[PDB]
């Protein structure tokens, strides 16, 4: 039986749109952690073969340098909104000559939420929703911001968030140890251990990835060496 | 003018069972000669040649797309092209530039290839054809070449003759143009046969 | 099943089951209640949070100084509206130079709403509004359903358990034309809260608040802005 | 050219002289300037011949179709319309100077004028054309209110032959027509027949 | 009388015994809508609606089911509200369209034919669904005369002296027949209207509801009007009265 | 160019001349100036010689089509229109000014056409360059209802006028009378005017062209 | 408002076959039947124009259309789809003309409007034409005679039959006729294998014929087809 | 086969297995769904249409209800069937009648506008997306030179000139009716013809109908502009047949 992709169930809601939202269910888990010392973002890599070389899994990308995103999903639906957001804050930046606050960036790619459709369209429009849930992580006027967007379009403020399949679970457990006074080092340490909780291998410094933007420094993507040393203190 | 920029001259002429069709050689820009072996005539079948004269680009481009829709032609339908159908193509080809037209005056001539019967013809630039019994000419020195067209044609000539009076015809016009000669070429063809000469001509 | 999945399509009984199901994407969303005196228009909005780590939905827009909206529903059908309705509004201000009124802007959504609920492939807008605003005629509250439809309301509340608030507004209706501001955003308080259990109630932290006015712009208050709003309620026990 | 159209009780009265020019030459002595656009509604062309035939051509076409699918004899004022339509959109490409003349059951005998900017106006009497600037003086001091039919008639007649005289782009014959609800009486001054005037001797 | 295998999915298909049923469906929709009346009679044309109240929560004059067409051209609707109102633009621009290309205001029987063109054209094609509303024109002029045209979701236009739309169709026809209105004038048929409205009206199944009322006609100049309060409320008190009996 | 156009008692005379000038050059000398429009529709084309061609063959075609449709006899009225439409289309881009003459159910009919699209019925037209001189004969020598013979002399006159008094025009005379029941498509008419007689004989001998390259090339 | 199918109504079977041309093609060999001749000076078309009542104009329609001077058509099959096909093929007859200003080639028009019948089926949103057709036509001094089938298929033949008892026709055709006819003859065993189907009495009005030879296409007149029904002349 | 289905070929303008178009013949039956019945005659200087004028409302304004139209001044037509596409198709025929005369210059024939109806019928007969027209036209005129012309074109896209036919429920049986009353070789006069028709009409449903419930076009050689006749006219049509 097939119907439109622009079709209401009887609860009130768009088939698509719902099964984009399982469609996330079987993504990479990632946490983000906001503080007042900067925001974090933690993802794993989940390297299926040795063969495969990890430093070319990148789950998380700089949008710009004051904001991050980490991706959970279809990656390749992720790259289209990735770019997006990279062209909407430079031509922000042109157009104003002003950074683009992450809540604007978040509901810029937001305004892509349910552009697709069958019937009366442009010949290059998209035919399904996005299967992809993002993590915006940045530094503004208004402080460090976590944004949290899913398929629907709904895009909401986070203080600690998890996306991906161990979502749940990593969820109870940041409730658990979150507190609107954390320091950056406990933000990232608590990011480690829950990740580490859900993760089905073994977590090592070529296993996940951990990046930081803090006020005074652009968005950063933790090396080899500095993973080590965080790993370190489990 | 555009047509005097490259010169250059094309003529046909009819014989008994023969026809004769014949062009200059030179490819000049304004007062500068470029080459002395430009090809103005091309075959567009057996028994059948088209003569093109004026903007050296617009010959070779009018010749190339003919070329294009003649092997089209001879590939949907099982035949070599009758000399009429050929100038209302070329005639059609030219007038769909009727508002940004190709700067060449073709001339035709050739052989019915179902019988022997000899034709000519000459176009606008825009493809308003013209059809005589006589001979056709098209190029910077027209006024010359009918000059000596009109007193050295006969009517019912043989091969031999026809090749004399087009080539003098052709050498003696030419030779009062500054932009055309640099060599005469002649493709006179009959049902059997097909000379092609180059006439002793000057270099000036 | 064969007159549910293209909006295209009657039922054998005169129905359209697309459009139907699109006004139960209202009932999804978190109540919102909007009321006017005769001076001011009010939306009064229950804010609503994923997880306790998550902020409260944002649920009240501002379209222009004396136009603003409360959402239910799909929330990216929500900002298509609310950008629609600023681009009229804008355009209405560079051409007459004069604010745009109320009930055209409303009739202008009805016309862009109604489109797509009788061409194949497309589908209706699966949001609500409550709309506040102020013109030459004063005070408004207009409510746009999924269908196209639209209401000039002396009150109303839509989304979850709604009826609550809608009987709460239905006994007070002669009251609200004479009251001042702040006994009016109160009685948008109380009809927003009774659609809670007794376990829950209001906060500086699920509650936005919206005034428009005579003497007032279109305006948003939430967090501490709301707290002298609040301060204010009877604490209504079980 | 000279074209004129006087309004009546029961109707209307047409005038036209028939010359048609290409520079000093002559291409057509005798035109035909009064265009039938239905039943009783003509129209007095100037102008380009080219534009204002196509135009008349696409107005009968328009108000014969607007006709039928009303079922109503059409409106002078409509046709007129049309014509507006068309000269004031197209003002810029058309040199067209328009007399719509006729009757209708509603609004009885009318005239009205579509010059070449493409406004339009209802009038008691117009005239238009090249020679029309010869007889303004003439038209000015001999128009009176209340005329009859004939009356309207021999004044067309009248100030045609004057226009003619003076304008070289005017001449030939004369075409008149008058229009009521009986119908249309078309008819042609030639020769004698044409208005004649004493001419200054000594 | 009820076929439905496939042969009731698109208004671009017929029924193996020659119908298409989306348009009976539409027609349907029609019907299980609240009544709307109209009658002409000799300085004019009238029109009453029974609008039904969901809510007391609703403003007075909310979802009116009485439009201004044109400045000369009333249009009463029943059936699904918002198509009403799609409609209803549609009259409006095809109106305004008609004095700028043709300098008058557009008679009644035309602006007719052509929203019914219009409504015709949806009930051919699966890309689109019929209109689910049928509606009447009102209109009047001395030229013309007073005029009053219905259009259904089929398409079809036809001219009237009365005509009733919903629920109660027929019952307010049998009430119609009984005035002899190509001789009242319209001052008198507003309180056979809302009477005829106060008697279909059913108050079991239906709750409260509100009365709309039209003039347009020579008490009007012409102009397409609402019914003055006092004169409202003269009608609907002549009616509740006229309902004891 | 000179062409003429006239209406007589059973039909219509069209008449042309045949001489096709480049600038100021004569290039032809029998040019065929009278085109076919459909059996009993006839044209004759001065102006942009491509343009009279293209449009007169156009008209032609679509008039054939119409005709197979119809399976009645093509009427002059739509020749007169798809041309003038045409060519108003154009804005007086396309030269053609023609003379369109031919027999109906409603009889015979002759209308001048202008490349900006205004056309004239007229018992008798003319156009070109030679036309005034033509235009003369007519006003000189036309009588309604003419016979035959008599219309075919007037307008070969009128033609020989433009031939004589004007440098566009020359050579001979083409004819196409056009009746209720004939077709006489007489090409030429007339040829008023011959080269004189070749006073020498110019014949080159075989070998006084001296030859640099030969190449013979045997087909089959 | 409207726009249009964009996907193929025809598609291949499992079995590799085309179903909807074959059921067009089932539409056709449901029609009243056609016979066309090839006979050496010139070309017979025939086909059973019978009414269904006294009433019908017989000579208001006709199954013998001319596409140019030199170019005649028949059809068996469904009527309107015919009556297209042959705006159509005249259209194209005159595009030839207007490029080439030679009269087109029998062979020629037949591919063209053999590529218009193709493209109905592939092309979105509709079906294949219900109609086979019979194009006579007199061109380079031979005559032609072609098929063209719903598929867009084409084939060239000396004689032939379609519509309803085709195959038998054709059998008749295979033995009652052969090559070095003259027109006449064709004309005469045209009639005679119609005559094998024609349930009824067959009279001038009861079937119509067209013939081509190098003066031109034409239909001929019911007194012809009279003198030529009285199994004589 | 003889009945045989396969896919959609009774929902969409497909073949069926055995060469049929379901939509086309259910467009024909949806002819029916009006439940009238209209006669067209054709004289020896003339051309008449009668069609059952049912209205059985005093609410409607008679004067509104009709199913003859005015195509030309001179050209008639009748429709039968569906309204609303009957009326579409009739404004479709105005529109190719005036577009024809603007294009050529002279009026359009029965012959070439039925025609032109038909292959735009056709279109419908062929293309998925949209369904037939369930309605009927049937055109009357005077031309030229072939005389008066009664035409008719269908849902299939076929079209035809006759010398009577009908259309509607009693279609059959007034083809029959008139096709008996033809082979007797009357002076087909306008009276003859007038009478013919209505009297076809009314034995098929026998009424002897009041001059209120049917209509009557009319076109003769005489006068061309076509004519819809006054109920007074109709009325002294009727009391003359029942004389005989």
């Not at chain 3, 829950?200 to 428009?212: A, E, H, M, P, Y």
């Not at chain 4, 042609?188 to 001797?201: R, S």
Request: hydrophobic share 40%; proline share 4%.
């Amino acid at each position: 039986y097939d119907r439109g992709v622009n079709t209401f169930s009887p609860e009130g809601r768009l088939f698509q749109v719902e099964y984009a939202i399982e469609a996330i269910k079987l993504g990479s888990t990632a946490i983000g952690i906001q503080t007042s010392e900067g925001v974090c973002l933690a993802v794993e890599k989940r390297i299926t073969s040795p063969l495969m070389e990890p430093s070319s899994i990148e789950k998380i990308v700089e949008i710009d340098a004051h904001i991050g995103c980490a991706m959970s999903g279809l990656i390749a639906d992720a790259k289209t909104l990735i770019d997006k957001a990279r062209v909407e804050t430079q031509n922000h930046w042109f157009t104003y000559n002003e950074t683009m606050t992450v809540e604007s960036v978040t509901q810029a790619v937001s305004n892509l939420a349910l552009q697709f459709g069958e019937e009366d369209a442009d010949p290059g429009a998209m035919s399904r929703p996005f299967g992809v849930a993002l993590l915006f992580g940045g530094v503004d006027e208004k402080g460090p911001q976590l944004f949290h967007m899913d398929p629907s379009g709904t895009f909401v403020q986070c203080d600690a968030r998890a996306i991906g399949s161990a979502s749940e679970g990593a969820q109870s457990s940041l409730q658990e140890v979150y507190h609107k006074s954390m320091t950056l080092k406990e933000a990232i340490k608590s990011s480690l251990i829950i990740l580490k909780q859900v993760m089905e291998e073994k977590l090592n410094a070529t296993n996940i990835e951990l990046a930081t933007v803090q006020p005074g420094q652009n968005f950063h993507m933790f090396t080899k060496e500095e993973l080590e040393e965080v790993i370190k203190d489990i | 003018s555009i047509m005097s920029y490259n010169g250059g001259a094309v003529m046909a002429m009819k014989g008994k069972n023969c026809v004769a069709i014949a062009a200059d050689r030179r490819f000049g820009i304004q007062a500068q000669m470029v080459t002395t072996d430009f090809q103005k005539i091309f075959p567009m079948g057996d028994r059948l040649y088209i003569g093109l004269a004026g903007l050296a680009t617009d010959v070779q481009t009018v010749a190339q797309r003919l070329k294009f829709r003649l092997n089209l032609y001879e590939l949907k339908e099982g035949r070599q092209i009758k000399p009429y159908t050929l100038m209302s193509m070329v005639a059609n080809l030219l007038y769909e530039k009727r508002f940004g037209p190709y700067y060449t005056e073709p001339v035709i001539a050739g052989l019915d290839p179902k019988t022997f019967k000899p034709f000519i013809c000459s176009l606008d630039l825009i493809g308003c054809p013209m059809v005589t019994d006589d001979f056709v000419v098209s190029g910077t020195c027209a006024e010359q070449m009918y000059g000596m067209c009109e007193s050295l044609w006969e009517p019912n000539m043989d091969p031999d003759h026809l090749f004399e009076t087009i080539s003098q015809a052709m050498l003696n016009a030419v030779d009062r143009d500054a932009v055309s000669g640099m060599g005469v070429i002649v493709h006179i063809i009959e049902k059997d046969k097909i000379t092609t000469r180059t006439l002793k001509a000057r270099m000036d | 099943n064969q007159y549910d999945n293209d909006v295209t399509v009657w039922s054998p009984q005169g129905r359209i089951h697309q459009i139907e199901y699109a006004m139960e994407a209202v009932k999804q969303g978190s109540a919102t209640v909007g009321l006017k005196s005769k001076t001011h228009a009010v939306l009064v909005a229950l804010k609503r949070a994923q997880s306790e780590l998550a902020a409260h939905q944002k649920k009240i827009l501002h379209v222009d100084n004396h136009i603003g909206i409360s959402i239910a529903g799909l929330t990216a059908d929500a900002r298509l509206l609310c950008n629609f309705m600023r681009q009229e509004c804008l355009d209405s201000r560079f051409v007459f130079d004069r604010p745009l009124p109320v009930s055209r802007l409303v009739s202008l959504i009805g016309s862009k709403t109604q489109i797509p609920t009788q061409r194949y492939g497309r589908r209706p807008y699966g949001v609500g509004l409550l709309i506040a605003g102020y013109d030459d005629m004063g005070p408004h509250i207009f409510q746009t359903c999924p269908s196209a439809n639209y209401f000039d309301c002396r009150a109303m509340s839509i989304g979850a358990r709604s009826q609550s608030a809608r009987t709460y507004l239905e006994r007070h209706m002669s009251e609200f034309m004479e009251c001042n501001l702040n006994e009016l955003v109160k009685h948008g308080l109380r009809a927003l809260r009774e659609t809670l259990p007794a376990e829950q109630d209001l906060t500086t932290k699920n509650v936005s608040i919206g005034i428009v006015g005579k003497d007032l712009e279109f305006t948003i208050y939430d967090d501490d802005d709301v707290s002298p709003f609040l301060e204010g309620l009877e604490e209504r026990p079980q | 050219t000279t074209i004129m159209a006087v309004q009546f009780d029961g109707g209307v009265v047409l005038g036209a002289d028939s010359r048609t020019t290409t520079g000093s030459y002559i291409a057509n002595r005798v035109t035909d300037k009064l265009t039938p656009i239905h039943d009783r509604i003509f129209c007095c062309r100037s102008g380009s011949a080219a534009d204002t035939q196509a135009v008349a051509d696409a107005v009968t076409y328009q108000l014969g179709f607007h006709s039928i699918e009303l079922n109503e004899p059409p409106l002078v004022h409509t046709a007129a319309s049309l014509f507006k339509e068309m000269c004031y959109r197209y003002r810029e490409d058309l040199m067209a100077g328009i007399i719509i003349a006729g009757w209708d059951p509603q609004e009885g005998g009318q005239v009205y004028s579509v010059p070449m900017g493409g406004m339009m106006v209802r009038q008691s009497f117009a005239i238009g054309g090249s020679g029309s600037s010869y007889i303004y003086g003439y038209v000015d001091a001999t128009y009176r209110e209340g005329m009859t039919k004939e009356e309207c008639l021999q004044f067309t007649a009248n100030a045609l032959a004057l226009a003619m005289e003076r304008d070289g782009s005017s001449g030939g014959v004369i075409r008149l027509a008058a229009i009521a609800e009986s119908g249309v009486e078309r008819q042609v001054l030639l020769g004698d027949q044409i208005p004649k005037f004493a001419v200054a001797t000594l | 009388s009820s076929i439905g295998t496939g042969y009731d999915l698109s208004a671009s298909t017929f029924s193996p015994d020659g119908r298409v049923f989306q348009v009976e469906y539409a027609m349907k929709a029609v019907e299980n809508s609240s009544t709307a009346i109209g009658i002409r009679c000799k300085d004019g044309v009238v029109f009453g609606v029974e609008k039904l109240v969901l809510s007391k929560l609703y403003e007075e004059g909310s979802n009116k089911r009485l439009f201004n067409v044109d400045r000369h051209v009333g249009m009463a609707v029943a059936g699904l509200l918002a198509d009403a109102r799609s409609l209803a633009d549609i009259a409006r621009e095809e109106a305004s369209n008609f004095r700028s290309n043709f300098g008058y205001n557009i008679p009644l029987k035309h602006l007719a034919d052509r929203v019914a063109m219009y409504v015709h054209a949806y009930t051919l094609y699966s890309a689109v669904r019929p209109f689910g509303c049928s509606f009447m024109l009102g209109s009047y002029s001395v030229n013309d005369g007073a005029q009053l045209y219905m259009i259904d979701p089929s398409g079809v236009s036809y001219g009237y002296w009365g005509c009733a739309i919903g629920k109660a169709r027929q019952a307010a026809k049998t009430e119609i027949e009984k005035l002899q209105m190509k001789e009242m004038t319209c001052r008198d048929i507003v309180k056979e209207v809302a009477k005829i409205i106060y008697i279909v009206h059913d108050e079991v199944k239906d709750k409260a509801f509100e009365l709309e009322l039209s003039w347009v006609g020579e008490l009007t100049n012409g102009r397409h009007e609402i019914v003055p309060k006092d004169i409202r409320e003269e009608a609907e008190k002549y009616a509740k009265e006229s309902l004891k009996e | 160019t000179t062409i003429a156009g006239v209406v007589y008692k059973d039909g219509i005379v069209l008449g042309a001349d045949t001489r096709a000038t480049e600038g100021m050059v004569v290039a032809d000398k029998n040019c065929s100036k009278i085109h076919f429009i459909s059996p009993n529709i006839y044209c004759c084309g001065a102006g942009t010689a491509a343009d009279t061609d293209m449009t007169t063959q156009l008209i032609s075609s679509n008039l054939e089509l119409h005709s197979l449709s119809t399976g009645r006899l093509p009427r002059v009225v739509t020749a007169n229109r798809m041309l003038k439409q045409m060519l108003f289309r154009y804005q007086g881009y396309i030269g053609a000014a023609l003379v369109l003459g031919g027999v109906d159910v409603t009889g015979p009919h002759l209308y001048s056409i202008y490349p900006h699209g205004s056309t004239d019925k007229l018992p008798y037209v003319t156009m070109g360059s030679g036309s005034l001189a033509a235009m003369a004969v007519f006003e000189d020598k036309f009588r309604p209802d003419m016979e035959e013979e008599e219309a075919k002399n007037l307008v070969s006159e009128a033609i020989a006028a433009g031939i004589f008094n004007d440098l566009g025009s020359g050579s001979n005379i083409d004819l196409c009378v056009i009746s209720k029941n004939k077709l006489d498509f007489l090409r030429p008419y007339t040829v008023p005017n011959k080269k004189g007689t070749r006073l020498g004989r110019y014949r080159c001998e075989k070998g006084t062209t001296a030859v640099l390259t030969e190449k013979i090339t045997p087909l089959e | 408002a409207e726009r249009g199918y964009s996907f193929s109504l025809t598609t291949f079977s499992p079995s590799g076959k085309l179903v909807q041309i074959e059921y067009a093609l089932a539409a056709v060999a449901g029609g009243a039947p056609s016979v066309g001749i090839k006979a050496a000076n010139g070309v017979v078309l025939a086909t059973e124009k019978k009414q269904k009542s006294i009433l019908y104009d017989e000579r208001s329609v006709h199954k013998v259309e001319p596409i140019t001077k030199h170019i005649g058509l028949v059809y068996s099959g469904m009527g309107p789809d015919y009556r297209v096909l042959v705006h159509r093929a005249r259209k194209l007859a005159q595009q030839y003309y207007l490029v080439y200003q030679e009269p087109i080639p029998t062979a020629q028009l037949v591919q063209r409007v053999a590529s218009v019948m193709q493209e109905y089926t592939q092309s979105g949103g509709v079906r294949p034409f219900g109609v086979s057709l019979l194009i006579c036509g007199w061109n380079e001094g031979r005559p032609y005679l072609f098929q063209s089938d719903p598929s867009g298929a084409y084939f060239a033949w000396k004689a032939t039959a379609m519509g309803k008892n085709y195959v038998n026709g054709k059998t008749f055709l295979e033995k009652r006729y052969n090559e070095d006819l003259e027109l006449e003859d064709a004309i005469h065993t045209a009639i005679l294998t119609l005559k094998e189907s024609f349930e009824g009495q067959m009279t001038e009005d009861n079937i119509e014929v067209g013939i081509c030879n190098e003066a031109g296409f034409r239909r001929l007149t019911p007194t012809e087809v009279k003198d030529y029904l009285a199994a004589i002349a | 086969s003889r009945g045989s289905s396969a896919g959609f070929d009774r929902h969409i303008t497909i073949f069926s297995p055995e060469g049929r178009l379901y939509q086309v013949e259910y467009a024909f039956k949806a002819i029916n769904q009006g439940g009238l019945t209209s006669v067209a005659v054709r004289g020896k200087d003339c051309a008449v249409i009668v069609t059952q004028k049912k209205v059985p409302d005093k609410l409607l304004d008679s004067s509104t209800v009709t199913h003859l139209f005015k195509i030309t001044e001179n050209i008639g037509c009748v429709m039968t069937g569906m309204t609303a596409d009957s009326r579409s198709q009739v404004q479709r025929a105005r529109y190719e009648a005036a577009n024809w005369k603007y294009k050529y210059g002279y009026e359009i024939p029965v012959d070439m506008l039925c025609k032109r109806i038909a292959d735009i019928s056709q279109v419908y007969t062929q293309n998925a997306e949209m369904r037939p027209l369930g309605c009927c036209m049937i055109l009357i005129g005077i031309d030229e030179e072939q005389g008066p012309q009664v035409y008719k074109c269908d849902p299939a896209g076929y079209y035809c000139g006759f010398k009577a036919t009908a259309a509607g429920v009693k279609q059959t049986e007034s083809t029959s009716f008139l096709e008996k009353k033809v082979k007797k070789k009357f002076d087909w006069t306008f009276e003859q013809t007038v009478e013919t028709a209505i009297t076809c009409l009314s034995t098929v449903l026998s009424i002897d109908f009041k001059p209120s419930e049917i209509e009557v076009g009319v076109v003769t050689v005489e006068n061309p502009k076509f004519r819809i006749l006054t109920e007074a006219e109709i009325d002294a049509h009727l009391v003359a047949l029942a004389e005989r």
